[PDB]
Amino acid sequence: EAEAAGVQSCGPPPELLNGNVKEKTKEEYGHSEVVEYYCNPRFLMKGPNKIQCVDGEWTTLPVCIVEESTCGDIPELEHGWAQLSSPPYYYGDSVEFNCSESFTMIGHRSITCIHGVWTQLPQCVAI
């Protein structure tokens, strides 16, 4: 329906100040379309992180602020370790873990620095 639809036309979503959008460009948004943004791996989301294409422009874009916090380093996995490491590991940053030879990883290969602790890590089991 025409909820507030004057419905001009809008293509790809704008850019977040520091962060960015995770959803890919459809270009055919047009009206009342919502887009989700994320912040940098060293900036946290302060804003509503989602926007809508109103008939004229998008809504209030989010804000990204540096938490200025670190997770320390890469943790230990019972039979796993890591591929990449980028210190300082700020909140919002990611790491890929790798399980040793003869072990298979179960879970997410990657983790995210969350409040000084990474997400969850996968588990490496004896193949």
Pairing status of strand 110-114 against strand 103-106? unpaired
Q: Which of 65, 29, 63, 66 is nearest to 48 (CA)?
A: 63
Report the CATH fold assignment for 1-68. Answer: Complement Module; domain 1 (2.10.70)
- Cα→Cα distances 108→39, 46, 79, 93, 101, Å: 21, 26, 14, 15, 17
Task: Please list every residue in the chain followed by a chain break, i.e. its C lies more than 2.5 Å from the next written N.
Answer: none
Name the CATH superfamily, with its identifier, for domain 69-127. Answer: Complement Module, domain 1 (2.10.70.10)
Beta-bridge partner residues of 45:
64
CB 49 within 8 A of CB 4: no
Q: Rounded to an integer, what distance in angstroms lies between the CA atom of residue 28 and that of residue 79?
A: 47
Q: Where are the domains of the chain?
A: 1-68, 69-127
How was this structure determined? It was done by: NMR
CB 57 within 8 A of CB 74: no
Q: Do domains 1-68 and 69-127 have the same CATH topology?
A: yes
Among positive and negative, which fits the CA dihedral 89, 91, 95, 99?
positive
